[PDB]
Amino acid sequence: MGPGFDFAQAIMKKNTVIARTEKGEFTMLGVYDRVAVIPTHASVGEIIYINDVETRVLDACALRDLTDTNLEITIVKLDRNQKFRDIRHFLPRCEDDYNDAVLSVHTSKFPNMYIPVGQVTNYGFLNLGGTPTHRILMYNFPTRAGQCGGVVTTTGKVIGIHVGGNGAQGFAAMLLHSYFTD
């Protein structure tokens, strides 16, 4: 509908796959080469389905901060025959607050879904499903189940992936450029 939705669509159309684990179907962001991200509660194993194709997992790393606190991001390297467009230059370098974000989801349950969530707060600490979690972004949109792995964007920045909600607010794990140096 406007330039935020433009940037969100450009990311969804080239840098997402549908990931399936034993814990469900998730929006999965591809970042560069065969490297993607997914919420850690997806419980990635040795095999994952990518657009309904059986795919070996070459590596999976559940990120934690240097206090050994959960960040809810798992970085997955896929045994796929095709690379993602490199979008690392759209990742923020530091923790921040944002205006006018979009949450974008693509699954069997919610295809081509885009949500203007408005202002995004650097919330910080969240007890997420009983697990102390850091680097959480918050938006005042009543997000539901099925949206996990959804991509949070502003114009020109890919800032997080949706990991939870409390019925009135939604929560995303930050994406930082420093997670994807090689």
Side-chain angles (χ1 to χ4, degrees), residues 126-147:
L126 183 68
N127 187 8
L128 178 64
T131 299
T133 303
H134 286 164
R135 285 186 178 148
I136 291 290
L137 299 167
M138 182 275 286
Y139 26 94
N140 286 292
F141 188 84
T143 53
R144 314 188 174 173
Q147 299 205 91

Side-chain angles (χ1 to χ4, degrees), residues 43-90:
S43 305
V44 176
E46 295 293 325
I47 301 172
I48 192 169
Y49 272 46
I50 300 295
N51 297 334
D52 278 307
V53 178
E54 190 184 5
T55 304
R56 288 188 291 269
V57 172
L58 296 174
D59 186 55
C61 179
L63 298 181
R64 305 185 68 89
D65 71 13
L66 295 179
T67 75
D68 193 30
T69 306
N70 180 47
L71 291 168
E72 201 54 21
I73 301 284
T74 292
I75 306 181
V76 180
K77 192 162 170 189
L78 300 172
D79 199 0
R80 198 146 174 260
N81 69 355
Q82 181 182 174
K83 298 178 183 61
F84 299 115
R85 178 193 183 190
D86 189 345
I87 59 166
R88 287 179 291 183
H89 58 292
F90 301 140

Side-chain angles (χ1 to χ4, degrees), residues 1-166:
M1 255 197 172
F5 290 109
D6 221 344
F7 182 80
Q9 184 175 256
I11 298 299
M12 294 310 287
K13 283 179 182 282
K14 289 290 170 175
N15 281 80
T16 66
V17 297
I18 299 174
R20 175 179 289 276
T21 74
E22 294 179 328
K23 311 278 169 102
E25 217 178 54
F26 297 86
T27 303
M28 166 176 267
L29 180 74
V31 180
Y32 73 106
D33 289 356
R34 296 166 291 167
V35 177
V37 293
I38 191 170
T40 297
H41 70 253
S43 305
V44 176
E46 295 293 325
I47 301 172
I48 192 169
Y49 272 46
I50 300 295
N51 297 334
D52 278 307
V53 178
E54 190 184 5
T55 304
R56 288 188 291 269
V57 172
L58 296 174
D59 186 55
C61 179
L63 298 181
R64 305 185 68 89
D65 71 13
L66 295 179
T67 75
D68 193 30
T69 306
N70 180 47
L71 291 168
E72 201 54 21
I73 301 284
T74 292
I75 306 181
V76 180
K77 192 162 170 189
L78 300 172
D79 199 0
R80 198 146 174 260
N81 69 355
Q82 181 182 174
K83 298 178 183 61
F84 299 115
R85 178 193 183 190
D86 189 345
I87 59 166
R88 287 179 291 183
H89 58 292
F90 301 140
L91 300 176
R93 273 159 175 187
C94 61
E95 302 185 18
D96 211 352
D97 315 279
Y98 297 89
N99 300 305
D100 192 28
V102 172
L103 170 62
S104 51
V105 168
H106 190 80
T107 67
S108 299
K109 181 186 195 181
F110 294 143
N112 297 302
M113 162 184 292
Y114 300 79
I115 305 165
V117 293
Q119 282 188 3
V120 179
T121 302
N122 178 1
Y123 193 91
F125 171 91
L126 183 68
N127 187 8
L128 178 64
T131 299
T133 303
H134 286 164
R135 285 186 178 148
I136 291 290
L137 299 167
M138 182 275 286
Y139 26 94
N140 286 292
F141 188 84
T143 53
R144 314 188 174 173
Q147 299 205 91
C148 292
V151 188
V152 189
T153 61
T154 66
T155 62
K157 295 188 251 55
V158 179
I159 69 170
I161 65 168
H162 188 75
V163 297
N166 59 26

